[PDB]
Every structure is written in C-alpha cells, then in structure tokens.
C-alpha cells in the first residue's frame, strides 16, 4: 500500500536537509581545441569512412550478392537518370552524369551502405524550376539547352556548396525540423507535381518553362490548351506501358511465393520498346520524340557561372535542404536495419562533395532515390561496392554502349516515372486518418499540400515549415487551464469538474496550467487565473487603497477615533497622473488597529468582500518561461501578495528554480519561500499556518 511518513518540505527546508553536489566560454574551448593523436586518427577515420569499412570486408560471403545488387542498381540507375533528366529541360545525355559522379564521391565519403545516390524526381523538378528561374532572370533550337545545362550545373554547384558548408558547420539536425506530417504532405505534393510535369512528355508537346508561383496550374494550361497536337501512337504506347507496369506491380507485390529475383518490367519493357523502335521505325512511319543521339564520352568541366549564382541563391537553399532531408530519411530505414551508426554531418559532407563534382562535370544535383535504394537493398546490397558497380555500369553505358539506348521513345520514360507512383501517391489516404488522430497534424498536412501546390515546389517548403513552427504556438496558445481539488482526503488532486467526491479546502484555490507559459499565452493565463479566482486582485487593491485614503482623510478631518473605530456621527475622484498612488502596497503602521477588510468597516464606506487566504499555482506541466512570462508572473504575484493573499508554486524542479533565480524575479516581496515540492504538502503547510 502507498504509505508515506515524510516531513513537509518547502524547497527551502529541503536543500538545507540534503546536501547538493558539484555544479561546475573557456571551459568548452579548452576541451574542443584539445588536440590528441588518437583524436586526430578518429576524426580522420570519420571524415574518410572508406578506410573504416574497406579492411573489414568478408569477400567470400559478400562479393556475389554485392555484384548482383550492383548490376541491378546500375541498370535501374541508367534507366532513371535519363528519365529524371527530362524534368529538367536538358538533353538526357547529362542525366547519366548525375548518376555517376555522386556515386563515386559517396563511395569514398559516405557512411550508409545501402543507398544508391543519384537523381530523384523531387530534386530534379526543384533543379528544373531553379534553372527556369535563372534563365528567366538572366540579363542578355541548339541555343537554349546549352544555357539550360550551364545554369543547371551552376545551381547544382551552389547547392553542393551550401550542403558542404552545412556539413562543415556540423549543423546536421536540420532534418529534425521537417518532421513527419510535413514530409508526407510535401511528398504527396511533389508526386502531384511529377504527375503534372510528365504530361508534356506523355503527350509529346512543347510547353514554355514556367517558374515559381502557381507552377502546376500554369503548366496545366500550357498542356491542356494544345490537346489537338498530341501524337496518338505515343499516347497509346505510353498508356499500354502504364497499365502493364501497374498490373505486373500488383502481381509482384502479390504472389510473393517461389518468385526469387522479382521480374524487372522496367528494364524488360524498355528493352521491348527499344527493340520495336529499331524494328518498325516510329521515327519514319510515325512522328515521335525519340531520345537524341548519345555522344560517346564525358564533357570538359566548366567554371560555375557567377551571374546565376546570385539569382538562384534562394532556390538552392531549398534544393540542398530537400536533398539532405531525402537522403537522411531514405538512409534512416537502412540504418535502423543492420544497426550501423550513420552520421548526419558526414552524410551531408559526402552529398555536398558529390554535388560539387557532378555540377563541375556538367551534371545536376541529386541524392539517393527511394525506389533505387529499395531495389539496391532488396537485391542484396551488402555495402557501397554495389554503388561502385552501378557507377561503373553507368560509365560503360556512357562510353561504349549508347546506340542501342539511342532509339528510346523518350515518353515511355515519362510513363515509367509515372509508373512507380502508386505507393508514392497512396499518402493521400492520410487526411482522414489524421483528422481523427490529432486535428492539428491534419491541418499541417493540408496546409503543406496547399502551399507546395500553389507556391511551387520551392518557397512552398519554407512557408510549410514556417506554418509548422507556428503550429506549436497554435497548440499552446490556449491551454486547457482548470481548477484542482483534493480527492479522497489524500495526496491526489485532479480537475474540479471531473469527479463527484470533489473536496476543496476553505479559501484555497489551486490553479494548474497544462502548457508552457511563454510570451504568446501569458495574457490568456492571467485571464484564466482571474476567472478561476473570481476577482481581480488589482481591482481589489485599488478599491482598498481608495477606501484607506478616504478613511485617512476622515481621520485628518477629525471624525474617526483610533483606540474601536468609533464614529462621532464626499467622493473625491482623483485626476490622472496621480491615480498611480492607488497601486501602492497597503501599509497601516500609522493606525494602531489591524483592519482586515473582511468583518466590517466604518460607515458609508464600501469594500468588496474577500474569501481567499491563499492560492497554489501548479507548475508541474510548465516546462519553460521567457522574459515576458517572467514579467507577467512577477506582476501577478506582486499584487496577489499586496492584497494580502499568500501565493505558492509547486511541481517545479531544481533546474527550473535555478533558471528562475537569474531573472530578477525574487526580491523583498516575492520571496523564495513560495516554492513547494508537491500540491499536498503545500496544502498541509497552508493548514498548519492557518491553525
């Protein structure tokens, strides 16, 4: 049974009954600049994770699986680079570049062993919007893709520079702020953006490159205004590949019995399309938009153009943050599995270096794609050597084998990108779940979706995270303040309007604020305390001071005798600039009596009656205070003590006491003897003091 026989403490008889322990900028500087040989070796190994895991290789049990997974992820990466390379309005030659240099750099500089870094559609569309904005903001057939590619390379370089700076500054906790509901809404909006943007390729039309605000609907108009100019054969083949891909995806997620190495319809039907393209000559018999001739070889590096460095400096921050968040989220699952310690700052540094290399070598920025990582992990990728195999596959397909991939319809790629989107868009079935879950996460999801579909894929994210930060204030703007009273005549206190056996001590009003008290709700806390208490202490003090002034005036006139309050037998309204004297503390030392303003009072003088001798502010749920809240609480406690009703604060810990000490909050009036351990011992001390 629950039996306690301890004395009553007041947070100031406690420290004097139990001794404390030691509580000890130059402190951190010395321990941060302490150079050591072992520390240098550790930091070098961390900055170069390759040396950490290359020696610890179990070849005879890892090599075959890694090779198979590497070939699979390489074929998927070559299929995906020149598909995501179309969301950016650049030739698909450079898409393969974006899937090789980041992989090679991440081999050396990365920690995760189950991600295949490359381009993914969300970042590809971010880069496309950024490059369109750059080309539109730049002061003055084959004359457009050149500047598009140059601007894309520069924007990728700047995104990589931002990522590298963030990694160097060791601010890797940025991925914390994005959360889960916001990432789900942003993911759904980006999926819708993919669906809208791929229409211009699924229909084989020409669309002007729109930028930033209302990007989807502008593209929607530019696509739907020219339906009569589509190509029927291209639409038919894209449709047929779409339905067959969906059907086999269903038949693959189902029938998962005796089906090793699930059938890769992506590559299979891209091969089928390339074959029928070389066979029946869609370019001659029909009019299609086949991928252009692939030049054999890389391209010389180009210096990052400075003119577009300044123009896009806004969108590159969003690109870098989205890339880092996607990479961290994708690698989080594969680090939770297989139990290895992924490092966020190291991941940021690796991704930044990869983006610098890719942008310098005429590619575009990217990070590990969800589907590519999934296929790499499922195929048996034991480490990043699978990423190396994918990189060398991309290298050989760039250098030698390009003519077989040249006759690709360039719209089957768009439909394939639209293909793996069912699980990408299934998150739409979450508004209903979140409506009955929190009623705030659903709001944040809806606002995120609206902002990312109206403001665009860019500034929409910033507005979404700003609204996310505002949502915390929304949650704590109006705390459900209540009144507490005893239950069962023991040390249990609950809400007054919740139980039938409620018992309240005489003249004691317990107030609890179940939310942190900061700047945005100190006024609401004061109003709720006012309502729960039932009167305004400032009003009571003002009326008492007015009555005392009238009494003193009568005594000076010579109508009241002090021994009492015997009377032998003019409302003086006060002007401005002098009413402030009514807020002064009540002192009656000049009067020999001890009038309490409770029993009675001399003639024709009225003072509101009082029924409170104490109140207890429960601060168990209060987690922090700021300057505004401290000032408001000090004023509240000040006139509460001034109207001669004691105040007590309970449920606070030693660090909270220490923080409140350095606030100029304690003085001769608001003493430090007001803090108590629990509610019950405060009530007990209250009863002992009263009688």
Ligand X SMILES: NC(=O)n1c(O)c(C(=O)c2cccs2)c2cc(Cl)ccc21
Ligand Y SMILES: CC(C)CCC[C@@H](C)[C@H]1CC[C@H]2[C@@H]3CC=C4C[C@@H](OC(=O)CCC(=O)O)CC[C@]4(C)[C@H]3CC[C@]12C
Give the residues lining the site for ligand X (CB under 6 A): 76, 79-80, 83, 120-121, 266, 369-371, 375, 413, 416-417, 419-420
Q: Does 566 bind its own copies (CB under 8 A)?
A: no
How far apart, in whole angstroms, are the C-alpha atoms of residue 67 and residue 389?
Answer: 7
Stretch of residues binding its own copies (CB under 8 A), selected from 150-158, 200-208, 409-417, 680-688: 680-688
Residue 221 interacts with, from its own copies, ligand X, ligand Y, none (CB under 5-8 Å by kind): ligand Y
Q: What is the closest distance, in whole angstroms, from the C-beta atom of residue 126 to ligand Y in the complex? A: 16
Q: Which of 520, 530, 554, 601 binds its own copies (CB under 8 A)?
A: 520
Q: Does 514 bind its own copies (CB under 8 A)?
A: yes
Stretch of residues binding its own copies (CB under 8 A), selected from 7-15, 34-42, 132-140, 291-299: 7-15
Place of tokens 């309490």: 596
Choose between 137 and 680: whose C-beta lies nearer to its own copies.
680
Q: Does 173 bind its own copies (CB under 8 A)?
A: yes
Our CA dihedral for 57, 59, 62, 67, rounded to 10 degrees, sits at: 110
Q: What is the closest distance, in whole angstroms, from the C-beta atom of residue 193 to ligand X in the complex? A: 12
Query: Which of 622, 610, 409 shows the shortest CA–CA distance to 506?
Result: 610
For β-strands 493-495 and 566-567, DSSP reports them as: unpaired
Q: Which residues contact 349 (CB under 8 A, 6 or more apart)?
A: 47, 109, 163, 164, 167, 168
Query: What single-letter DSSP state applies at residue 673?
Result: G
Instruction: Report 375-434 residues binding its own copies (CB under 8 A).
Output: 377-378, 380-382, 434
CB 506: neighbour CB atoms within 10 A? 11
Place of tokens 């030659």: 93
Residue 213 interacts with, from ligand Y, ligand X, its own copies, none (CB under 5-8 Å by kind): ligand Y
The SS3 call for residue 373 is: helix
Choose between 370 and 398: whose C-beta lies nearer to ligand X.
370
Our CA dihedral for 392, 397, 399, 402, rounded to 10 degrees, sits at: 180
Q: How many residues interact with its own copies (rule CB under 8 A)?
A: 100
Our CA dihedral for 292, 296, 302, 305, rounded to 10 degrees, sits at: 10
Q: What is the closest distance, in whole angstroms, from the C-beta atom of residue 157 to ligand Y in the complex? A: 9
Q: Which residues contact 408 (CB under 8 A, 6 or more apart)?
A: 82, 270, 273, 274, 277, 290, 291
Contact at 8 Å (CB) between 95 and 83?
yes
Q: What is the closest distance, in whole angstroms, from the C-beta atom of residue 184 to ligand X in the complex? A: 15
Choose between 277 and 464: whose C-beta lies nearer to ligand Y.
464
Q: Does 499 bind its own copies (CB under 8 A)?
A: yes
Q: Does 596 bind its own copies (CB under 8 A)?
A: no
Q: Which two tokens stand for residue 568?
A: 């032998």
* Residue with the CB atom nearest ligand X in the bound state: 420
Residue 162 interacts with, from ligand Y, ligand X, its own copies, none (CB under 5-8 Å by kind): ligand Y
Q: What is the closest distance, in whole angstroms, from the C-beta atom of residue 531 to its own copies in the complex? A: 13
Choose between 231 and 482: whose C-beta lies nearer to its own copies.
482
Q: What is the closest distance, in whole angstroms, from the C-beta atom of residue 158 to ligand Y in the complex? A: 6
Contact set with ligand Y (CB under 6 A): 161-162, 165-166, 169, 213-214, 217-218, 221, 306, 309-310, 313, 317, 450, 454-455
The SS3 call for residue 561 is: strand
Q: Does 40 bind its own copies (CB under 8 A)?
A: no
Choose between 193 and 546: whose C-beta lies nearer to ligand X.
193
C-alpha distances out from residue 114 to 13, 104, 381, 384, 424, Å: 58, 14, 6, 7, 20
Q: Where are the beta strands (DSSP E) in 22-133?
A: none
Choose between 49 and 381: whose C-beta lies nearer to ligand X.
381
How far apart, in whole angstroms, are the C-alpha atoms of residue 365 and residue 388?
Answer: 18
Specify the DSSP element, H or E, that contains 619.
Answer: none
Residue 80 interacts with, from ligand X, its own copies, ligand Y, none (CB under 5-8 Å by kind): ligand X
Choose between 204 and 468: whose C-beta lies nearer to its own copies.
468
Contact at 8 Å (CB) between 331 and 132?
no
Q: Which of 40, 259, 469, 603 binds its own copies (CB under 8 A)?
A: 469
Q: Which of 422, 550, 613, 631 binds its own copies (CB under 8 A)?
A: 631
Q: Does 518 bind its own copies (CB under 8 A)?
A: yes
């Amino acid at each position: 049974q629950y039996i306690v026989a301890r004395p009553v403490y007041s947070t100031n008889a406690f420290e004097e009954n139990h001794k404390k322990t030691g509580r000890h900028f130059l402190d951190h500087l010395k321990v941060c600049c302490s150079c050591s040989p072992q520390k240098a070796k550790r930091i070098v190994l961390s900055l170069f994770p390759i040396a950490s895991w290359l020696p610890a290789y179990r070849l005879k049990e890892w090599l075959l699986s890694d090779i198979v997974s590497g070939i699979s992820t390489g074929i998927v990466a070559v299929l995906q680079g020149l598909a995501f390379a179309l969301l950016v309005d650049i030739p698909p030659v450079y898409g393969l570049y974006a899937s090789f240099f980041p992989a090679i750099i991440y081999l050396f500089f990365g920690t995760s062993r189950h991600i295949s870094v490359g381009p993914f559609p969300i970042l590809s569309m971010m880069v496309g919007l950024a490059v369109s904005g750059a080309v539109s903001k730049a002061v003055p057939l084959l004359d457009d893709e050149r500047v598009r590619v140059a601007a894309a390379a520069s924007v990728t370089v700047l995104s990589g520079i931002i990522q590298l700076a963030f990694g160097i500054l060791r601010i890797g906790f940025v991925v914390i702020y994005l959360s889960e509901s916001l990432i789900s809404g942003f993911t759904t909006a980006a999926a819708v953006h993919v669906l809208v943007s791929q229409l211009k390729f699924i229909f084989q039309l020409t669309v002007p490159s729109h930028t930033d605000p209302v990007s989807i609907f502008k593209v929607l108009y530019s696509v739907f205004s020219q339906i009569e100019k589509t190509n029927i054969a291209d639409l038919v083949t894209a449709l047929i590949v779409l339905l067959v891909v969906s059907i086999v995806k269903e038949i693959n997620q189902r029938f998962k019995d005796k089906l090793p190495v699930p059938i890769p319809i992506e590559f299979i039907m891209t091969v089928i399309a390339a074959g029928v393209s070389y066979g029946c000559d869609f370019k001659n018999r029909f009019k299609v938009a086949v991928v252009g001739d692939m030049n054999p070889g890389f391209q010389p590096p180009i210096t990052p153009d400075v003119e577009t460095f300044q123009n896009t400096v806004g969108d590159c921050f969003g690109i870098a943050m989205v890339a880092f968040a996607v990479a961290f989220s994708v690698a989080s699952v594969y680090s939770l599995k297989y139990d290895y310690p992924l490092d966020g700052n190291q991941e940021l540094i690796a991704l930044g270096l990869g983006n610098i290399v890719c942008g310098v070598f005429r590619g575009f920025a990217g990070s590990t794609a969800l589907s590519r990582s999934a296929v790499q992990e499922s195929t048996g990728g034991k480490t990043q050597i699978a990423g190396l195999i994918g990189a060398i596959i991309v290298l050989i397909v760039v250098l030698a084998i390009g003519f077989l991939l040249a006759p690709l319809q360039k719209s089957v790629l768009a439909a394939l990108a639209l293909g793996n989107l069912k699980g990408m868009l299934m998150q739409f079935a979450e508004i209903g779940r979140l409506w009955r879950k929190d009623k705030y996460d659903c709001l944040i999801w809806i606002m995120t979706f609206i902002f990312t579909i109206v403001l665009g894929l860019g500034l929409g994210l910033a507005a979404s995270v700003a609204f996310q930060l505002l949502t915390i204030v929304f949650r704590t703007q109006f705390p459900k303040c209540s009144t507490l009273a005893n239950i069962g005549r023991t040390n249990i206190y609950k809400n007054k309007k919740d139980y039938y056996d409620m018992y309240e001590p005489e003249g004691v009003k317990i107030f609890r604020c179940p939310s942190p008290i900061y700047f945005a709700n100190i006024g609401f806390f004061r109003r709720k305390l006012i309502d729960a208490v039932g009167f305004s202490p400032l009003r009571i003090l003002r009326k008492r001071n007015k009555a005392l002034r009238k009494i003193r005036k009568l005594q000076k006139q010579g109508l009241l005798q002090v021994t009492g309050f015997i009377c032998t037998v003019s409302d003086e309204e006060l002007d401005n600039n002098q009413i402030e004297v009514l807020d002064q503390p009540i002192n009656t030392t000049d009067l020999p009596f001890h009038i309490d303003w409770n029993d009675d009072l001399p003639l024709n003088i009225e003072v509101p009656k009082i029924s409170l001798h104490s109140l207890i502010l429960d601060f168990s749920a209060v987690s922090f205070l700021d300057v505004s809240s401290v000032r408001g609480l000090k004023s509240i406690l000040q006139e509460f003590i001034r109207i001669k009703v004691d105040v007590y604060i309970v449920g606070t810990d030693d660090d909270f006491i220490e923080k409140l000490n350095r606030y100029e909050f304690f003085d001769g009036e608001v003493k430090s003897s007001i803090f108590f351990l629990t509610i019950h011992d405060a009530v007990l001390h209250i009863l002992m003091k009263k009688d």
